[PDB]
Ligand binder design. Structure first.
Ligand SMILES: *[C@@H]1O[C@H](CO)[C@@H](O[C@@H]2O[C@H](CO)[C@@H](O)[C@H](O)[C@H]2NC(C)=O)[C@H](O)[C@H]1NC(C)=O
Ligand code: NAG
Ligand code: NAG
Lengths: 247, 596
């Protein structure tokens, strides 16, 4: 959608692989402000918000933490404590039109600068002077929404660029979106250390004949010492024995 | 809200919609010139009429803003362009008569028609042929006859026509509250902005001749050399006291002596430095020509060329039904789109022409950030001066050997230096007196102190002293000689060319200092000096957003006008001519005539 009608999307309760998007050389601009993109795969938040639109190629500077501009002031504003990243890429091959892609419009005239995460949807004719504007444009009347004359031949700076701004919110509710875990393979009959689904400890893992009822995860016998565990990826009952020691 | 913010909003609203429509019109123009076709003619009609019908209204609504309180002088100058009466201030009848009379002057000049007496049924034009014959010849009769006929069929019926044009254009000047149209022309070189940087229309007139007499010490010596070579070539047809007629100047208006250069060759043993054999032998095409020009500019300091230019711009071979006029042009269509248009050829002269046009293109990108009303130069002469700067810089022998155009073992001496300097001065300084006299004559025919009769006879009697043209057949009343000139009938300001040579001389001099070169200015190369390119960009990026007087403060610190580079460039020629025409006396007398 156009910049004055920026598309806001909410995503939660899924695994996100930020690496592949990071490992994408076909994307023009990838600027991260919260943390390093490589580290992003590890930590996680409770939900994600995406602000997607298309602007002019020369206006990409406007979308930045604590940045001002016509697009930044009257179409979409940002705070300085932004967490997340910004992705941009040219769309002249798609959005630029030989007949002119005048569908895309932006708010040039507005009484006040737009607030962060706020949209101005009114198409009110603006008053640049002191006289009121009643319907048809007069002296101090100019259309708030200027269209775009994108052409296939307009140089790099004038091409339409798609921009998606990704923010991660970490409300007190439990985290819903997190990166993958990268489970390894399995070994047996050797003193190793394990971290099955967050339950850690050392020992030797052998086969067992116990019968876990189909909703338990692990079993301890007495004095609260874990004996059996159930492998998340194969669903079988293992057994744990401490590694040998003695005087 | 104060009116000034309303002015800013209105200007932004105007230029936003103006940029796209101007881009559409420029795209149509480039399509028509790249594709000579009937349909593109109607495209030009339907784009130009739309652009005019859009711009005229915006200029018309530029009156309710009181443009006298804007604190930002840049915004004031931006609003100044729209707050211009233009051509609609006049009444309908006078304006349409003026347009018609401009049309008839243009048609008459483009249709110069004279028949030789042996073939009165088939005339010839200024097209190659008769014009070539009267421009490339060693004779006295045919050139004189052609000059007389041209003045008697373009100047005979254009005297009242040009009188009406002058009086009506000056009346339109009063319609703009100007007592003369010369003031309207000089308004380009006039700013009332920064105190101490301001200028007036009047002062330019006097300073044009204030810098004209300083080159005349060299002009007299060059005229004496030309007269001596005429004595050795034209037998007893030029008086030793006097000077040469109009038809013996190589050009029918005395513009350049290049056609007369062969007569006044200094020394033919050492010819001009021509790399055409090497240029072809290296197998460098127009694409390689443009690439090498780009590399030379990068060494100078200007950045890489934008993409699409390799695709949108045309370079050579109009060829087939896909016709394309290739008059060397640079096209800034706006919206970050640029094109260049030539029949670029494998030649050193064509190499320099391509350098000129691509330097124009580079300056076109230089003011990219400025709005539509500021995407220009400080003055119209700076663009052409820049465009000739690298043309000067791309032909120097050091530059040729640096990129391997000349042979690795090529050396120059005094003879080739003298020949090159004389040939160059036959074009550069040989037109400055003619340029000055034409500009001043136009100023005094606009002012109107001289009566109707003192128009062509006065022009000739002044050309006798300034350019040095005797009258084999004088033109008193029934002929209009200046009317037989291209830039007299199309409303063309002509002082721009006069200032362009001085400006480019100053810029080349300053770059020569800020390029680490030693020796004479004509042997100066400014390649492989990135600081020179940085200074160039500092000059260029200002654009129309800054006054021309302010612009003339970094490259040269003299906001006024100087003539030092003109004297310094042709210094070896002057010192050679001092000892060359030792026996003959310099100067010419304005009393002898070929008829008596
Ligand atoms: C987790 O995914 C793996 C990968 O597909 C599943 O492993 C396969 O499961 C099927 C179903 O029995 C077997 O036929 C394949 O031989 C398994 N491939 C292996 C072990 O490499 C695994 O079943 C999934 N976990 C579930 C469904 O709980
Ligand atoms: C244009 O000419 C008219 C005619 O006198 C004048 O009233 C008007 O002020 C002029 N425009 C400007 C901008 O001066
Ligand atoms: C121009 O582009 C080429 C290829 O990308 C590069 O090698 C060169 O350094 C560039 N020159 C400038 C001045 O940017």
């Amino acid at each position: 959608a156009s910049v004055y009608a920026w598309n806001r999307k909410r995503i939660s309760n899924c695994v996100a692989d930020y690496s592949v998007l990071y490992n994408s050389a076909s994307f023009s601009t990838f600027k991260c402000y919260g943390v390093s993109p490589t580290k992003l795969n590890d930590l996680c938040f409770t939900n994600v918000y995406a602000d997607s639109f298309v602007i002019r190629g020369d206006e990409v500077r406007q979308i930045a933490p604590g940045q001002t501009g016509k697009i930044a002031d009257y179409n979409y504003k940002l705070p300085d404590d932004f967490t997340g990243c910004v992705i941009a890429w040219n769309s002249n091959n798609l959005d630029s039109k030989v007949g002119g892609n005048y569908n895309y419009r932006y708010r040039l005239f507005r009484k006040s600068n737009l607030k962060p995460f706020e949209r101005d949807i009114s198409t009110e004719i603006y008053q640049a002077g002191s006289k009121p504007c009643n319907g048809v444009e007069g002296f101090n009347c100019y259309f708030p929404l200027q269209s775009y004359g994108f052409q296939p031949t307009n140089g790099v700076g004038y091409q339409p660029y798609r921009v998606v701004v990704l923010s991660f919110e970490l409300l007190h509710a439990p985290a819903t979106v997190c990166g993958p875990k990268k489970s390894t393979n399995l070994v047996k009959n050797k003193c190793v250390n394990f971290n099955f689904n967050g339950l850690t400890g050392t020992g030797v893992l052998t086969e067992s004949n116990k019968k876990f009822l189909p909703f338990q995860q692990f079993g301890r016998d007495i004095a609260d010492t874990t004996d059996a565990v159930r492998d998340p990826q194969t669903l079988e009952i293992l057994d744990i024995t401490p590694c040998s020691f003695g005087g | 809200s104060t009116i000034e913010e309303q002015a800013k909003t209105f200007l932004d609203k105007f230029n936003h919609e103006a940029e796209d429509l101007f881009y559409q019109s420029s795209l149509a123009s480039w399509n028509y010139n790249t594709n000579i076709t009937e349909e593109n003619v109607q495209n030009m009609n339907n784009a130009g009429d739309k652009w005019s019908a859009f711009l005229k209204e915006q200029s018309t609504l530029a009156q309710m803003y009181p443009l006298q309180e804007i604190q930002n002088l840049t915004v004031k100058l931006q609003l100044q362009a729209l707050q211009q009466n233009g051509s609609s201030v006049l009444s309908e009848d006078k304006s349409k008569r003026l347009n018609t009379i401009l049309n008839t002057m243009s048609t008459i000049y483009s249709t110069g028609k004279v028949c030789n007496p042996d073939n009165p049924q088939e005339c010839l034009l200024l097209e190659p042929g008769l014009n070539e014959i009267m421009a490339n010849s060693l004779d006295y009769n045919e050139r004189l006859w052609a000059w007389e006929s041209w003045r008697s069929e373009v100047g005979k019926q254009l005297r009242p026509l040009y009188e009406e044009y002058v009086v009506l254009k000056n009346e339109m000047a009063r319609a703009n509250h100007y007592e003369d149209y010369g003031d309207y022309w000089r308004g380009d070189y006039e700013v009332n902005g920064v105190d101490g940087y301001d200028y007036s229309r009047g002062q330019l007139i006097e300073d044009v001749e204030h810098t004209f007499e300083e080159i005349k010490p060299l002009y007299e010596h060059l005229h004496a050399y030309v007269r001596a070579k005429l004595m050795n070539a034209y037998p007893s047809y030029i008086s030793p006291i006097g000077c040469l007629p109009a038809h013996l100047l190589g050009d029918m208006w005395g513009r350049f002596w290049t056609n007369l250069y062969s007569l006044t060759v200094p020394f033919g043993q050492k010819p001009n430095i021509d790399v055409t054999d090497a240029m072809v032998d290296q197998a460098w095409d127009a694409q390689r020509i443009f690439k090498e020009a780009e590399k030379f500019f990068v060494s100078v300091g200007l950045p890489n060329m934008t993409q699409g230019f390799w695709e949108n711009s045309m370079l050579t071979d109009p060829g087939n039904v896909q016709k394309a006029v290739c008059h060397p042009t640079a096209w800034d269509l706006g919206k970050g789109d640029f094109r260049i248009l030539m029949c670029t050829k494998v030649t050193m002269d064509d190499f320099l022409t391509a350098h000129h046009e691509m330097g124009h293109i580079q300056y076109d990108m230089a003011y990219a950030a400025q709005p539509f009303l500021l995407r220009n130069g400080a003055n119209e002469g700076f663009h052409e001066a820049v465009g000739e700067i690298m043309s000067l810089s791309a032909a120097t022998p050091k530059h040729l050997k640096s990129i391997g155009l000349l042979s690795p073992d090529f050396q120059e001496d005094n003879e080739t230096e003298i020949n090159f300097l004389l040939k160059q001065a036959l074009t550069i300084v040989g037109t400055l007196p003619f340029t000055y006299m034409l500009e001043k004559w136009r100023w005094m025919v606009f002012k109107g102190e001289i009566p109707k009769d003192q128009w062509m006879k006065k022009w000739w009697e002044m050309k006798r002293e300034i350019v040095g043209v005797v009258e084999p057949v004088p033109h008193d009343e029934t002929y209009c000689d200046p009317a037989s000139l291209f830039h007299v009938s199309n409303d063309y300001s002509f002082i721009r060319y006069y200032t362009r040579t001085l400006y480019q001389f100053q810029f080349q001099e300053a770059l020569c200092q800020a390029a680490k070169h030693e020796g004479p200015l004509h042997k100066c190369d400014i390649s492989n000096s990135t600081e020179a390119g940085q200074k160039l960009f500092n000059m260029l990026r200002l654009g129309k957003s800054e006054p021309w007087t302010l612009a003339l403060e970094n490259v040269v610190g003299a906001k006024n006008m100087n003539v030092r580079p003109l004297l310094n460039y042709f210094e070896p020629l002057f010192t050679w001519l001092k000892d060359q025409n030792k026996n003959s006396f310099v100067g010419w007398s304005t009393d002898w005539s070929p008829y008596a």
